[PDB]
Amino acid sequence: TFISRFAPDQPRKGADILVEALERQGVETVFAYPGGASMEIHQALTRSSSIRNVLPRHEQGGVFAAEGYARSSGKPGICIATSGPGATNLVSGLADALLDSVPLVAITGQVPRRMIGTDAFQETPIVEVTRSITKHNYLVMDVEDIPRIIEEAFFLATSGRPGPVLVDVPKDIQQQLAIPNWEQAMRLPGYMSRMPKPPEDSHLEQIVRLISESKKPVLYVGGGCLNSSDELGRFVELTGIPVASTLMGLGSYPCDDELSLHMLGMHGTVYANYAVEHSDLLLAFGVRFDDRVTGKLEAFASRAKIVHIDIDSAEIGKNKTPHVSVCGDVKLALQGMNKVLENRAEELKLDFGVWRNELNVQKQKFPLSFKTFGEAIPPQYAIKVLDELTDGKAIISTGVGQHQMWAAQFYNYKKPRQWLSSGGLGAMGFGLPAAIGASVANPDAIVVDIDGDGSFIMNVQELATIRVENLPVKVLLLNNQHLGMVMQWEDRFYKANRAHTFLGDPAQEDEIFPNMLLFAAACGIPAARVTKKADLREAIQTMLDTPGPYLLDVICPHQEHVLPMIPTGGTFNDVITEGDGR
Amino acid sequence: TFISRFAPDQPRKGADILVEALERQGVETVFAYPGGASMEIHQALTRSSSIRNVLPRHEQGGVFAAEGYARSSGKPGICIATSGPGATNLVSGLADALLDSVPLVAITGQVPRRMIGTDAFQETPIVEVTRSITKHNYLVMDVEDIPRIIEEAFFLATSGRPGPVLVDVPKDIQQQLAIPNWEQAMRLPGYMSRMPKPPEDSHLEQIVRLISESKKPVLYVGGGCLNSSDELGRFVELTGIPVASTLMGLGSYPCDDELSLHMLGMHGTVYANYAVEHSDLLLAFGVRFDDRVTGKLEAFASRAKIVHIDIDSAEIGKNKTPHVSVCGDVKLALQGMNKVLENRAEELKLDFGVWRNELNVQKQKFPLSFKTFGEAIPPQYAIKVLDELTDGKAIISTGVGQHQMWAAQFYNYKKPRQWLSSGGLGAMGFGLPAAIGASVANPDAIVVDIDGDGSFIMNVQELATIRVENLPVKVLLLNNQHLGMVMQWEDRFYKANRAHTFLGDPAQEDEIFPNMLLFAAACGIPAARVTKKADLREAIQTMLDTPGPYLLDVICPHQEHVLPMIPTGGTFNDVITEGDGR
Amino acid sequence: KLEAFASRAKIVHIDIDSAEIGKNKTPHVSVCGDVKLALQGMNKVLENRAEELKLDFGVWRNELNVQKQKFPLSFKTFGEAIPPQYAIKVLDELTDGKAIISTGVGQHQMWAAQFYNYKKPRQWLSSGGLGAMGFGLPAAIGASVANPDAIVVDIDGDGSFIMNVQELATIRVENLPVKVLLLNNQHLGMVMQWEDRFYKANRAHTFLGDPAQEDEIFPNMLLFAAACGIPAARVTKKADLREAIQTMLDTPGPYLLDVICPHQEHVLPMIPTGGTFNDVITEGDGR
Ligand SMILES: Cc1cc2nc3c(=O)[nH]c(=O)nc-3n(C[C@H](O)[C@H](O)[C@H](O)COP(=O)(O)OP(=O)(O)OC[C@H]3O[C@@H](n4cnc5c(N)ncnc54)[C@H](O)[C@@H]3O)c2cc1C
Ligand SMILES: Cc1cc2nc3c(=O)[nH]c(=O)nc-3n(C[C@H](O)[C@H](O)[C@H](O)COP(=O)(O)OP(=O)(O)OC[C@H]3O[C@@H](n4cnc5c(N)ncnc54)[C@H](O)[C@@H]3O)c2cc1C
Ligand SMILES: Cc1ncc(C[n+]2c([C@@](C)(O)OO)sc(CCOP(=O)(O)OP(=O)(O)O)c2C)c(N)n1
Ligand SMILES: Cc1ncc(C[n+]2c([C@@](C)(O)OO)sc(CCOP(=O)(O)OP(=O)(O)O)c2C)c(N)n1
Ligand SMILES: Cc1ncc(C[n+]2c([C@@](C)(O)OO)sc(CCOP(=O)(O)OP(=O)(O)O)c2C)c(N)n1
Ligand SMILES: COc1cc(OC)nc(NC(=O)NS(=O)(=O)N(C)S(C)(=O)=O)n1
Ligand SMILES: COc1cc(OC)nc(NC(=O)NS(=O)(=O)N(C)S(C)(=O)=O)n1
Ligand SMILES: [Mg+2]
Ligand SMILES: [Mg+2]
Ligand SMILES: [Mg+2]
Ligand SMILES: [Mg+2]
Ligand SMILES: [Mg+2]
């Protein structure tokens, strides 16, 4: 039974209805930045004793913090901004949440309804702007529509395929007095009629029948299995099928397990891409067949019967036509198949040891490799030390670039929602704010931001947010003085012609620029720099043991390349296995 | 005669056609951030010996730098970004350039044409997103359309009412070989037919006739007069009409002149708002009648015959119907009226000394005032010292907030394009990157960023850009540890209830947080902090005399309020003249 | 009701539009491509592996042949009044089923689909997705131009025919052998049928005649054809129906045959909107 701060017959401001609408949704943390259009909302937030606001230093850091809050907990992330410039700073976060299917609810202030369309002070048509980069958006035109729209916003953002939902609230609606009606029915008739239903037994028995008829099955797990870690693990025990995860599906099946093929795709392991290339049954659970995994669609799984399970009917058959399809929750599809695989266990006699040994041979001949040059710190080795010292139980958020791939390859994630990274949009500056949202949603957890010197500096202002909110956010900065991912593509396909990829100072060429330690010192965050490989283990241990925030500037040779690499539009026969920029 | 780097019959990449198309437009400086979708453009930029790229540390800093480059020189500002997250970071700059009518050309990379709409890697419909926040945008669908679209983009961005134009270029178009045709005719038939024509003599003679019949005339000058400083000054000599400028029109008529009423509007001087309130002829030259100037439209210039000259026919009569209107360039309208005012000089016998003395009395009784508390530095006084030590010849870029208003009130700008500020959108984090673009376009000029502690930290990463490019950018940081503008509205209309406006550390409440000096030290920029009013003059002098970049952390008491203040929707009778937060 | 449609069947969906596969119902096996090529590929497998598969569904066909004989398409004849179903059945016989049929929208559209045996595709031109009235007469114009040596017949309704009646001038000027089998029931029959079933026969602007002269055929469609110089005739008795349709076919050039039908007829069978197979209506009309 919800206990309101107002009487059921007492009129209250629309902003007070908005905050209470969040309280009735279970919202405990918002990321709001104040402004003229949203001052009424911020005043109403102070009256709430259950909703905590984490003030960022940039609205892009506020929406990215809402993503990490959502990616690391399954709950929806709520960010609030003002009209005009405050709303336009959320654009990168909204498009990022849409491509990665992150439940998010963004509330933006707006000019009064009478001033909309008049080029008013700090007015931008944020609904027209964000319609193509959000799952759905609203423009509240009456104070009585607030309880319904907020309920519809959280329902659309969390149900089906999750995504961001923006709610634009004009200022005159926030100030208008009204008595809210919390019993209104949602006006989503076509959406609810198209919601997926529990999977039929005829579809599940046909999948189990294809498993027994197959000799080389491979599991294709992605971001749709973040809530099916137990169901997927039970499915692997009953089948013994090796698991290949996407960049979004890391942690769904433990990377340290013997049946794990780790990541597949452009920068996936050689044995994971080998398994899909020479498979006869591809179980695509919670994936969307991105070109980062398939490359050339004509050659991707060219000899496999494709079984695609997805909660979005628009994804089934988009880039590749499957043989058997199941539109619904992969969590329920696994539960239904586990019952069939257990009763009919001895009837099926499932054993793929011959196919697994074919992959174990490929795993031992082409494993993830990194070369150590003298005392220079290998970035792959540094992340491998972080795995050991944290026992693989740390929540990892990353930026975008070479460090993002090495953090995915050389860290064994035991559970999903430990791996927070921008995969669909690939937005730099995501690592640091996402670690803020993850640390708030998981206070007793080890949160480490494996960031790059280019991605870290984009939202470096959020270091002040970490200090003020006293969050134990660790920053494992892999500094290579370059935009490493773009630098790698210059060495491979452009004759190493540098085109504005060096991030240091050309005057003092051999000086670490910028001095990231002074960035942490400016915000009162203890920091240290490590350059020699021998001092690396003690430095990372000091970062973890030191209470509160900590930044570790790890210097790495910039000539390193992420391996292996399948060029864009290439096949498995075009995989690059060796080479760098020396 | 343009000299190309390729033979007229030699095929070249589409990216090389794009860069040469910029060279043929006179482009010398671009602000490009590399990415997978725009690597071909960056490779082609290195082959250009005339186009210099200023690499920012954030695309929002790149587009804001393109604004300051344009606002301080009249030339169009060119910023380049990659697809997906790089393009979405330009959104705040595009909407800011549209509301302030800043000529800007944004070039964004895009996924290959075959992959558009497939939720590809780093794909966002940037044309669908930015259609409502740009003057016009394009999606290049063929390599042969590059010479025409670039010519149309620069024409639309600089002609008529200036604005931002976005050009989305897919990657396959950048790589395709072709022979460019630089003789293509622009396909803008309806736009050129609607372009304003030179003003007719019948309209100009009717304006001059209303000037002689009026007794209390007031000039209403705005951002449309940035290229008419000489024509406007000549017009004032022949009429003796006092000049009231908007936040965008500062510098058009010198603030130090005796005939200048300084700024009008919400935070405009009392005597400027008094002149418009009690006028019989309002000469609105290059303005758009924003609610920040009018307030309540029914009471704004309620006794004046309104003469509105504007180059956009959609602005004439939008918020207020004028008596006489002239659709065209205010530069030509002033030239035509100056000829009539000089030949018919003794015939008209123009003299408004009685009306000017009525305003001089109001100027002496209600001037711009600030109170000095002990040795605490008044933010108004610090800007007044910067005016004296720079002789008013410095290019000033500001953020948004209280410091933005004090930099407009207490600095006498002698020429337009010395004042770079976000007025229409009012985007924080604009001051520092705009100073970068202004310093590049004006290397031998004094560029000072009067920023606030909240606005400065949003794009603090651009300090690395200032050091690498070795730009003599001065940062006069008015630090009040608060979001001062929002804090002021809390004291006035919300009983001083703080709602997430304090930017410091609540644990160490009386400690300056963050330590902005260490931000400059991280990027190798000399910095210093001044707290006592006596040491203020020597500190600002050290900032100016020290070559290269410099940051001056000026500590100010946060209880200061921007005065005077006309509340939203109020009239001249509701102006607040005294009060603060003590 | 999608939940009950083919509730016990493995659905195999072949379609050239990937957006249609799995939209309203999820199939077990899907093939995105041209069904023409999919049939060619399956025919080769079915012929080589013919004796290996031993395909025989005579037991399932006999189960349907029993249902076909107990519930066939039925129409009732009332005295000498012309049954609209019978008139279309006569047109099938006199044209040997080789005529190109274009229809409007309504009851006449359904009877032209039920009681005519089309031997080849592209003989049946009708608005199904949008269901636009006034489609029959102009579509017969385009079909007669694309197929000059073919028998083109417009099975139109009095409401649909009048919407684009101006195209009769186009038929005469272009000299097109367009036959108009007008099933005149003086009503918007399809909307009238739904009034009798679900609205207690409360007429809501469905009568197309003249209420002053209630028992007079209004409008006189014969004078519409006469205005455009098209020979026309009206038939009311069932005995004169066979000779009237034969005169329409044998007369060269355009021809309009005003076939008067009792308006109380209903299109059967009928499954109500959102219903299942257990809700099929098999008998009943408006008498
Ligand atoms: C620099 C860089 C390099 C990259 N390289 C790689 C790479 O080498 N390999 C790689 O895999 N990725 C890589 N990516 C990431 C990438 O572009 C995509 O995010 C990824 O390839 C696709 O993730 P996904 O298949 O799991 O689909 P997601 O984006 O995770 O979407 C989930 C899918 O499952 C479905 N779904 C969601 N919820 C449910 C549910 N409850 N039940 C059933 N279905 C559900 C959704 O409809 C959707 O189709 C890279 C990214 C970057 C920035
Ligand atoms: C915190 C804050 C407080 C503010 N308070 C104030 C305030 O107290 N006072 C104030 O004035 N502003 C204030 N503003 C700024 C503000 O919101 C608007 O930018 C400003 O009020 C309107 O500027 P403008 O009238 O010059 O029109 P602009 O935005 O400068 O547009 C120029 C106008 O002239 C026309 N034009 C352009 N070129 C030509 C040409 N060549 N010939 C003829 N016409 C042309 C255009 O069509 C357009 O209508 C504030 C902003 C902020 C962020
Ligand atoms: C907002 C934004 N702007 C530009 C981007 C285009 N990209 C990249 C990519 C993969 O998206 O290329 O398509 S990666 C990259 C450079 C990474 O700098 P680092 O942080 O130092 O990481 P590292 O460990 O050194 O490699 C750029 C510039 C991007 N994604 N986001
Ligand atoms: C991207 C962005 N986000 C939020 C904004 C909403 N606003 C403001 C306003 C006027 O737009 O209110 O409508 S001003 C302001 C706070 C100014 O912090 P400061 O830099 O310290 O300046 P000061 O000298 O102390 O006053 C905010 C939060 C904004 N405009 N831009
Ligand atoms: C342009 C147009 N306007 C109105 C229509 C709505 N409908 C119908 C329907 C099925 O679409 O109802 O949804 S059928 C119909 C009446 C048919 O008049 P008839 O020609 O005399 O045929 P009959 O042999 O008597 O039954 C109407 C009014 C329509 N489809 N098209
Ligand atoms: C807190 O700082 C400021 C500053 C400022 O101008 C200096 N004005 C305001 N307030 C309004 O503008 N109210 S309003 O007129 O209803 N708007 C158009 S809105 C919805 O807020 O964009 N707050
Ligand atoms: C430079 O860093 C990277 C990284 C990376 O993935 C790790 N891929 C690429 N290149 C492409 O993606 N080419 S592409 O396939 O034509 N694109 C979809 S696009 C237009 O570039 O977005 N560059
Ligand atoms: Mg930033
Ligand atoms: Mg780097
Ligand atoms: Mg401040
Ligand atoms: Mg489909
Ligand atoms: Mg009818």
UniProtKB/Swiss-Prot annotation, chains A, B:
Cysteine sulfinic acid (-SO2H) modifications at: C255
Coiled coil segments of this chain: 329-361
Keyword annotations: Amino-acid biosynthesis, Branched-chain amino acid biosynthesis, Chloroplast, Coiled coil, FAD, Flavoprotein, Genetically modified food, Herbicide resistance, Magnesium, Metal-binding, Oxidation, Plastid, Thiamine pyrophosphate, Transferase, Transit peptide
Binding-site positions, FAD: 101, 161, 223, 246-247, 264-267, 286-290, 310-311, 329-330, 423-424
Binding, chlorimuron-ethyl: K171, D291, R292, W489, T568
Gene3D superfamilies attached to this UniProt entry: 3.40.50.970, TPP-binding domain
GO molecular function list: acetolactate synthase activity; flavin adenine dinucleotide binding; magnesium ion binding; thiamine pyrophosphate binding
Biotechnology: Introduced by genetic manipulation and expressed in sulfonylurea resistant plants.
Functional description taken from the UniProt entry: Catalyzes the formation of acetolactate from pyruvate, the first step in valine and isoleucine biosynthesis.
The protein's name in its UniProt record: Acetolactate synthase, chloroplastic
Organism: Arabidopsis thaliana
From Swiss-Prot, chain C:
Primary location class: plastid
Binding-site residues, chlorimuron-ethyl: W194, T273
Residues annotated as binding FAD: D15, I16, D34, V35, G128, G129
Record key words, sorted: Amino-acid biosynthesis, Branched-chain amino acid biosynthesis, Chloroplast, Coiled coil, FAD, Flavoprotein, Genetically modified food, Herbicide resistance, Magnesium, Metal-binding, Oxidation, Plastid, Thiamine pyrophosphate, Transferase, Transit peptide
Known uses: Introduced by genetic manipulation and expressed in sulfonylurea resistant plants.
GO MF annotation list: acetolactate synthase activity; flavin adenine dinucleotide binding; magnesium ion binding; thiamine pyrophosphate binding
UniProt binding sites for thiamine diphosphate: Q107, H108, G131, A132, M133, D158, G159, S160, N185, Q186, H187, L188, G189, M190
Origin: domain of life: Eukaryota
GO biological process: isoleucine biosynthetic process; L-valine biosynthetic process; response to herbicide
Phenotypic consequence of W194S: Slightly decreased catalytic activity. Resistant to imidazolinone and sulfonylurea herbicides
Residue positions binding Mg(2+): D158, N185, H187
Cellular-component GO terms for this entry: chloroplast; chloroplast stroma
Phenotype reported upon loss of the gene: Lethal when homozygous.
Subcellular location per the Swiss-Prot or TrEMBL entry: Plastid, Chloroplast
Coiled coil: 34-66
Claim: DNA damage is one of the keywords in the record: no
Summary of subunit composition and partner proteins: Homodimer or homotetramer. The acetolactate synthase complex contains both large catalytic subunits and small regulatory subunits. Homodimer. The acetolactate synthase complex contains 4 homodimers of the large catalytic subunits, and 1 homotetramer of the small regulatory subunits.
Family according to the record: Belongs to the TPP enzyme family.
Function: Catalyzes the formation of acetolactate from pyruvate, the first step in valine and isoleucine biosynthesis.
Protein's name according to its UniProt entry: Acetolactate synthase, chloroplastic
Span of the entire protein shown here: 381 to 667 of 670
